[PDB]
Design a protein around this ligand. Structure first.
Ligand SMILES: *[C@@H]1O[C@H](CO)[C@@H](O[C@@H]2O[C@H](CO)[C@@H](O)[C@H](O)[C@H]2NC(C)=O)[C@H](O)[C@H]1NC(C)=O
Ligand SMILES: *[C@@H]1O[C@H](CO)[C@@H](O[C@@H]2O[C@H](CO)[C@@H](O)[C@H](O)[C@H]2NC(C)=O)[C@H](O)[C@H]1NC(C)=O
Ligand SMILES: *[C@@H]1O[C@H](CO)[C@@H](O[C@@H]2O[C@H](CO)[C@@H](O)[C@H](O)[C@H]2NC(C)=O)[C@H](O)[C@H]1NC(C)=O
Ligand SMILES: *[C@@H]1O[C@H](CO)[C@@H](O[C@@H]2O[C@H](CO)[C@@H](O)[C@H](O)[C@H]2NC(C)=O)[C@H](O)[C@H]1NC(C)=O
Ligand SMILES: *[C@@H]1O[C@H](CO)[C@@H](O[C@@H]2O[C@H](CO)[C@@H](O)[C@H](O)[C@H]2NC(C)=O)[C@H](O)[C@H]1NC(C)=O
Ligand SMILES: *[C@@H]1O[C@H](CO)[C@@H](O[C@@H]2O[C@H](CO)[C@@H](O)[C@H](O)[C@H]2NC(C)=O)[C@H](O)[C@H]1NC(C)=O
Ligand SMILES: *[C@@H]1O[C@H](CO)[C@@H](O[C@H]2O[C@H](CO)[C@@H](O)[C@H](O)[C@H]2NC(C)=O)[C@H](O)[C@H]1NC(C)=O
Ligand SMILES: *[C@@H]1O[C@H](CO)[C@@H](O[C@H]2O[C@H](CO)[C@@H](O)[C@H](O)[C@H]2NC(C)=O)[C@H](O)[C@H]1NC(C)=O
Ligand SMILES: *[C@@H]1O[C@H](CO)[C@@H](O[C@H]2O[C@H](CO)[C@@H](O)[C@H](O)[C@H]2NC(C)=O)[C@H](O)[C@H]1NC(C)=O
Ligand SMILES: *[C@@H]1O[C@H](CO)[C@@H](O[C@H]2O[C@H](CO)[C@@H](O)[C@H](O)[C@H]2NC(C)=O)[C@H](O)[C@H]1NC(C)=O
Ligand SMILES: *[C@@H]1O[C@H](CO)[C@@H](O[C@H]2O[C@H](CO)[C@@H](O)[C@H](O)[C@H]2NC(C)=O)[C@H](O)[C@H]1NC(C)=O
Ligand SMILES: *[C@@H]1O[C@H](CO)[C@@H](O[C@H]2O[C@H](CO)[C@@H](O)[C@H](O)[C@H]2NC(C)=O)[C@H](O)[C@H]1NC(C)=O
Ligand SMILES: *[C@@H]1O[C@H](CO)[C@@H](O)[C@H](O)[C@H]1NC(C)=O
Ligand SMILES: *[C@@H]1O[C@H](CO)[C@@H](O)[C@H](O)[C@H]1NC(C)=O
Ligand SMILES: *[C@@H]1O[C@H](CO)[C@@H](O)[C@H](O)[C@H]1NC(C)=O
Ligand SMILES: *[C@@H]1O[C@H](CO)[C@@H](O)[C@H](O)[C@H]1NC(C)=O
Ligand SMILES: *[C@@H]1O[C@H](CO)[C@@H](O)[C@H](O)[C@H]1NC(C)=O
Ligand SMILES: *[C@@H]1O[C@H](CO)[C@@H](O)[C@H](O)[C@H]1NC(C)=O
Ligand SMILES: *[C@H]1O[C@H](CO)[C@@H](O)[C@H](O)[C@H]1NC(C)=O
Ligand SMILES: *[C@H]1O[C@H](CO)[C@@H](O)[C@H](O)[C@H]1NC(C)=O
Ligand SMILES: *[C@H]1O[C@H](CO)[C@@H](O)[C@H](O)[C@H]1NC(C)=O
Lengths: 342, 169, 169, 342, 169, 342
């Protein structure tokens, strides 16, 4: 009698990658792969997830909020994980801005970058005492104050001069003004209007030159007088003029320089920000809680160590992307059944 | 594998072996007996389990958007950032691909070392009157049908049940 | 290797072994006989072949110029792009360096497992009258000159050609 | 008699890297390495390879072509793999440009970036109807139209005013105008000339100010009046003046802003582009077909899995760069021949 | 390990084994004898040594500041540069983590292959009158106390010191 | 009698990571890890290490030196490894500069980037022959020449005009002027002063416009007339005015363009630089020699192959950072002592 060692033969439809034996069929396998499927986003587990930059600051754009629109002046919750729903964020009211002429639209998302952002304890520069003639803090219809009347972005002052006379460029110095080693985000721009209204609001009807410097970054603009594009992302018909608005970014202890003439929107309430919230691109009516947020697959929770599919930015507790569906052998190599004996 | 082909083992499946991966076959007047070993199949499943836990531990930094990028101003920087993400992903993927494959090679090959052990466990219990062929088989001075072999598979076998000499641990 | 030194094998080359990598030596009144085994040498060449095919499969994203870089305007971005290329290359190179080395360690070591198998193939065919030394050698009750050994190398050997007991598969 | 297992001893000049045994000598090896050798470039196998941005648009620079030089107005083939032969592309005729004053030279290579590029179905802005006085579309000698006479870059209009009077900066609005989600590349600049000719072509002899905005990117120029550098990369002697020319890049649905005075070269025919061709730096009189294109080694086809040598950008089906020449053991460790027996 | 559990070896430490890692135990009327082998313990220490030298060789490009970055002007580029450094580091770290772990798995497992060899060295010197159990043990026709076993550990053992047959190399 | 193989049991407090057996206890280990400890920096072994950009050019800032301050005009040693001790480098004397209005502060560190940097064989542009009226090379108190009197930064010329009259923007052309394929770093700026002093030094009292172009990079400034910030990083009381200064970077064979009015500080002695020294951020009173320089741990020399702790830029012969303390098994798995026998 002969007693021998043997191995099994059985259903071996699963194939595996080996170095020495090429690719082989195997009894069974533990898969390490999944393809996730597109779904709605969710609040990231061990954190808090940014929505409209300001919840509780209802019915407003992040851009609106950013710009310090009258009503939209609510308070910002800190988070360590932010989502970007607007690649091109919009304004939903207030004074007509010619958005597409400045990096401005991105301001909400720049802010989103940070863990902590705040409106401002104080305003940077004294609106009236500013270089140039004494200014009436221009107040504008079509930007309803809460009561009403003339509400103008806390962000900046509508610098209208008594003693209406043309100006040779002036320089305001926007200092640091932020607690801690916070990032300061300054904001500003210029109003310009039609021939007649120009002369009326400021004694001049001439294109106006504006130049800002901040940390070696310099920008120069020239105002427009007549024939402005249709107003959009606003309210109703002070079609008279438009605002060109920009942001300036100030690192801890750095100063800024705005040269200006007439139409100047001097900075006022100015963002202080600090810390780094992790940002991702997500289409967002946030629903529930997931382990992990995938730019594409969206809300997703961790089943297997890897996933296959479209690679993308993903934050949290995420499975690792992998080229191709991987499998771990949990069985033995296929062996054809034996009568190969005597 | 390479060991099994050279030292004339048998590239034979025993589709009889249901309850386990490796065990013993038994040959004679009774025909052919087959039995799984429920420790070699268990010890193999262990390694694999612990190997999974091994592959799972790996952590790789999140990989996310750029804090101060800015999506219309900084496109060229933003573009290099994608390159970065792509490369990172493609790199860490090839690495994992390697880790697993190595891991599989390990498991697949180790199978022969099970067989080899299982043989030596057998040699003990068959006593000094058996004859080690080298085949992975033993010529035994007594008959072994299904029942006998099942004791062999369980470790409750005793030579001298057919009055023959016995090693006693 | 470590196995061969400990279990007193022989770190000896047999520059006689032309047609193969591993096989048998044969000792006695005839002097020394040597023969390659043309399956152990083949089975070793296989692994290696399939190991090459393995190393070859690896794919790594192309790595090219930046679509909107611009060669006088964006130098700082363009510079970081080089860093990226350099690091990527240096990273994926160290990984491959590892893959191969591991691969070599594998092949180099596996050699001893050939020898070990080749021994067990031998044990079968020499019958139950031979004596397993542990040396990787067998004391045999009959003489074995070049011709006999060549049958041993081919698997067309039969004990009892010198009337001695035989295992029959 | 003793029968034993043994291994071979033989010529083992090849050495290999192992973890456990250090570096060991081996019977034989399969090499995985090659050093390639510098050679001419070639059309990349499974694709099509860009040459002068426009073949069939003969005897012209890519810059020429880019700028829309009269003759050089041929049609662009799409490709998915482009080569860069000019780090500093040249102009070969037409009107004297002071190249080194704008990012302009790179325009060909920006375009090269894309899979698809096209001259333009239409021109962006109505040359005559443009803000400022009615303009004669300036036509210039030294840029031979096909017949001849006055051919001026399809790219932009030479804006000469009837009613020759000095101007306070004006703003043209360059809209999107591109099919699909294509990239729009706008183009423009300004002419300026000597004291007398200035006053003659435009009633003024004053440095002229120009500012463009596009997607938060702002540029400001000031024209020169007298003493221009020798003309080069042109034709012959309207040495009177020179052109400073620039490009503007417009992402899908974005608008542009050019403020200008006199000398304005308003944009006309404007590039639409889309898709991403893979670009490499290659010196190019293209010859034949290779598996793979190496910035240095050039035309190269895949022999072994890796290569050693100079790392560089390489596209296609390329061997992977490797630190040092690697070898796979195809044999056994060296064993000194034996009489170590008894 | 998996081999040791299956082929009923002994998961037993012999805290007697001071001068070495692997060696022999000896059983009988004398009680239990224990002796280290000073080549198996040495040959194991070798591998490890050469494995260290192996892990040490790895070179990875320096990773430094950007030549034309500029610390207040180019922050966004400078930021992506950190990303790059972080990823690189996190990538090359996971790779090394793998290299070592593999390396450890190697060393840890190889231990059983020492034992296995050490057995075969023993089988030689005990002569043809001993009985290979498969246990990793041998039933011997003579007594072996501490002194005898120490000769076994040193390779200066000779059967027939208890007048029994001997293999002579 | 039974003779058997066995393994040891002994003190096994060290634990190790394996794939197949999980984490196991082991006889002994070779550690591959260290945490280094913060210490002073040192001269990097197989190289030379930059300090104040100019040793032997004593008691001066790198910025001072960079700007070509009178005394601080010593000679620069080449090095292949540089350290950055000043994230915001300072000026320590000479004429009041409004630093925070230009990328200027970084100039020292830009220079530090290079292997070779030099002051200048010659000066770029003829100060007096420059476009605009003939200029007296303005010489300024409060920047002591070695003897004394009026020393003004070799970098640039204080362009004061005889024939004091307001100017329409002029264009100087700063040519290449650098040996080899060196990088040229040009330097320049403008002085401006109070109402009265303006009119006195230049016949005008008007904000002055300045625009430079270099390799498609454009910058535009507007001078200030009254109310300058307190002077700092200077000497003593020509509080009259201030200097706004900038740098311009010229790649091999490229030209530059400065448009200017009055206050112009025309470039003079101009940096040529070449080669790439490896730069790191290090707080630096350099002490001794180390194997390797770590942005944090500082001076450090190579003990073990890896280190654990804070990752950072490190140059030289550095241990590789590693996630967690790693150990190589130098022993056997723990085995409980045996009486498990019969
Ligand atoms: C080994 O695995 C492969 C699949 O993993 C089996 O062959 C496949 O048969 C199925 C039948 O539906 C096909 O869908 C697959 O395309 C086939 N594989 C390929 C890619 O050729 C094979 O039968 C398995 N086992 C054996 C006994 O070889
Ligand atoms: C992933 O895991 C989480 C649990 O951590 C799931 O979250 C549940 O979501 C449902 C509806 O969205 C809620 O009612 C539960 O409160 C959540 N947790 C549980 C199970 O109590 C999440 O849905 C999972 N899957 C997906 C698709 O994200
Ligand atoms: C093992 O390999 C090395 C080379 O790979 C052999 O020694 C070399 O001898 C040649 C003779 O021309 C020299 O060019 C090399 O420089 C030597 N190697 C080094 C780096 O020392 C050696 O002879 C090979 N085989 C043996 C038997 O050791
Ligand atoms: C790499 O491979 C290709 C084949 O795919 C070679 O292309 C040949 O080139 C010659 C001359 O350049 C032509 O006559 C043939 O038509 C091409 N293919 C063949 C062989 O029919 C290419 O030359 C190879 N080597 C190099 C150096 O690129
Ligand atoms: C195996 O290793 C671990 C530590 O590496 C030992 O258990 C530790 O006991 C010490 C006593 O001071 C504690 O500080 C550790 O926290 C314990 N480890 C953990 C994390 O649980 C263990 O004793 C070692 N050997 C044995 C015999 O198991
Ligand atoms: C790292 O290694 C170097 C040796 O290469 C040590 O340098 C010594 O430093 C001391 C004082 O700083 C000097 O007196 C010696 O001249 C140096 N070399 C020797 C030993 O002769 C360095 O100190 C080491 N450790 C550190 C903390 O950097
Ligand atoms: C909203 O706007 C009005 C101005 O349009 C602000 O104050 C105005 O109304 C007050 C009535 O309580 C008057 O006392 C003020 O004189 C008047 N302001 C003017 C035009 O001089 C008012 O503060 C705003 N709402 C809030 C936040 O209270
Ligand atoms: C690996 O394979 C085995 C079968 O080869 C799996 O199943 C085993 O474990 C089960 C636990 O769910 C037990 O119920 C079974 O007794 C046993 N075998 C079978 C299927 O009868 C094991 O779970 C597989 N996967 C893993 C997690 O390793
Ligand atoms: C080339 O240039 C000329 C202008 O220099 C263009 O048209 C001119 O010649 C025509 C003769 O067929 C006349 O009918 C036009 O009036 C005249 N243009 C002027 C100066 O008013 C001509 O269109 C161009 N060549 C082409 C593409 O046909
Ligand atoms: C690996 O080594 C062997 C020799 O060690 C190579 O050669 C073998 O295969 C050849 C096919 O070209 C046969 O003709 C030979 O019989 C055989 N050995 C020799 C040289 O006689 C094998 O090709 C080598 N390389 C590869 C591809 O693995
Ligand atoms: C330092 O500055 C003075 C100018 O303030 C330079 O030359 C001055 O002094 C000289 C005395 O040797 C006179 O000959 C010069 O006329 C005078 N310059 C003027 C104001 O015209 C002097 O060159 C400088 N020091 C050095 C480097 O020698
Ligand atoms: C690995 O472990 C061994 C002990 O297990 C270390 O010690 C050995 O080598 C020493 C050289 O310093 C000798 O003096 C000892 O004889 C020997 N064993 C002991 C401790 O008695 C060895 O050095 C360890 N580390 C390394 C470098 O591998
Ligand atoms: C505004 O008017 C005042 C008084 O009428 C005049 O003196 C002054 O010049 C004007 N303001 C300025 C600063 O031009
Ligand atoms: C094996 O043989 C014995 C006869 O001694 C018998 O008792 C037993 O039933 C047999 N087993 C089977 C089921 O074949
Ligand atoms: C081996 O021995 C036999 C004697 O029986 C003989 O026939 C044969 O030729 C021998 N082989 C050689 C070539 O030594
Ligand atoms: C050009 O001349 C016309 C008529 O002679 C004149 O009315 C007009 O002011 C001038 N153009 C402009 C817009 O200045
Ligand atoms: C082993 O046995 C022999 C008896 O022949 C004796 O000489 C020797 O001392 C013994 N060894 C020990 C120390 O037990
Ligand atoms: C300076 O004065 C001269 C002579 O008094 C005068 O002719 C000239 O116009 C003035 N300089 C310039 C270029 O304005
Ligand atoms: C800040 O300045 C604004 C003008 O923007 C002024 O109206 C306001 O009172 C100041 N601060 C407060 C208390 O909001
Ligand atoms: C576009 O405008 C140009 C002026 O650049 C005009 O001459 C041309 O007719 C227009 N389009 C065509 C048909 O080329
Ligand atoms: C370079 O021009 C300067 C003015 O900055 C002049 O004083 C000097 O003589 C010139 N070169 C020399 C010799 O320093």
């Amino acid at each position: 009698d002969r007693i021998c060692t043997g191995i099994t033969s059985s259903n071996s439809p699963h194939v595996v990658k080996t170095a020495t034996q090429g690719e082989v069929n195997v009894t069974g396998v533990i898969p390490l792969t999944t393809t996730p499927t597109k779904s709605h986003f969710a609040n990231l587990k061990g954190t808090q997830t940014r929505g409209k930059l300001c919840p509780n600051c209802l019915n407003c754009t992040d851009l609106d909020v950013a710009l310090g629109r009258p009503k939209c002046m609510g308070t910002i919750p800190s988070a360590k994980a932010s989502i970007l729903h607007e690649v091109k964020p919009v304004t939903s009211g207030c004074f007509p801005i010619m958005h597409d002429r400045t990096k401005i639209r991105q301001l909400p998302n720049l802010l989103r970058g940070y863990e902590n952002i705040r409106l401002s304890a104080r305003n940077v520069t004294n609106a009236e005492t500013a270089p140039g003639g004494p200014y009436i803090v221009g107040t504008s219809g079509s930007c309803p104050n809460v009561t009403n009347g003339n509400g103008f972005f806390a962000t900046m002052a509508w610098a209208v001069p008594k003693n209406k006379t043309a100006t040779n460029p002036l320089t305001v110095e926007v200092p640091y003004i932020c607690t801690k080693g916070e990032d300061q985000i300054t904001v500003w721009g210029f109003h310009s209007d039609d021939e007649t209204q120009m002369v009326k609001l400021y004694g001049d009807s001439k294109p106006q030159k504006f130049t800002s410097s901040a940390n070696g970054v310099t920008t120069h603009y020239v105002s427009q007088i007549g024939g402005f594009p249709n107003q959009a992302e606003d309210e109703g018909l002070p079609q008279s003029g438009r605002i060109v608005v920009d942001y300036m970014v100030q690192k801890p202890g750095k100063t800024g320089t705005i040269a200006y003439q007439r139409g100047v929107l001097l900075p006022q309430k100015v963002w202080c920000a600090s810390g780094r919230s992790k940002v991702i691109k997500g289409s967002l009516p946030l629903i529930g809680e997931a382990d992990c947020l995938h730019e594409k697959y969206g809300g997703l929770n961790k089943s297997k160590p890897y996933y296959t599919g479209e690679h993308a930015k993903a934050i949290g507790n995420c499975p690792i992307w992998v080229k191709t569906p991987l499998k771990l052998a949990n069985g033995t190599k296929y062996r054809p059944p034996a009568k190969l004996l005597k | 594998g390479f060991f099994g082909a050279i030292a004339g083992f048998l590239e034979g499946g025993w589709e009889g072996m249901i309850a386990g991966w490796h065990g013993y076959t038994s040959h004679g007047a009774h025909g052919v007996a087959v039995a799984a070993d429920l420790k070699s199949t268990q010890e193999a499943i262990n390694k694999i389990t612990k190997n999974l836990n091994s592959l799972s531990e790996l952590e790789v930094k999140n990989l996310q958007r750029l804090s101060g990028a800015m999506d219309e101003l900084h496109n060229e920087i933003l573009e290099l950032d994608e390159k970065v993400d792509d490369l990172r992903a493609d790199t860490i993927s090839s690495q994992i691909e390697l880790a697993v494959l190595l891991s599989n090679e390990g498991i697949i090959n180790s199978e022969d070392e099970h067989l080899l052990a299982l043989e030596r466990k057998l040699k003990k219990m068959l006593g000094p009157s058996a004859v080690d062929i080298g085949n992975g088989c033993f010529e035994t001075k007594h008959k072994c049908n299904q029942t006998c072999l099942d004791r062999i598979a369980a470790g409750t076998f005793n030579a001298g049940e057919f009055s023959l000499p016995t090693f006693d641990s």
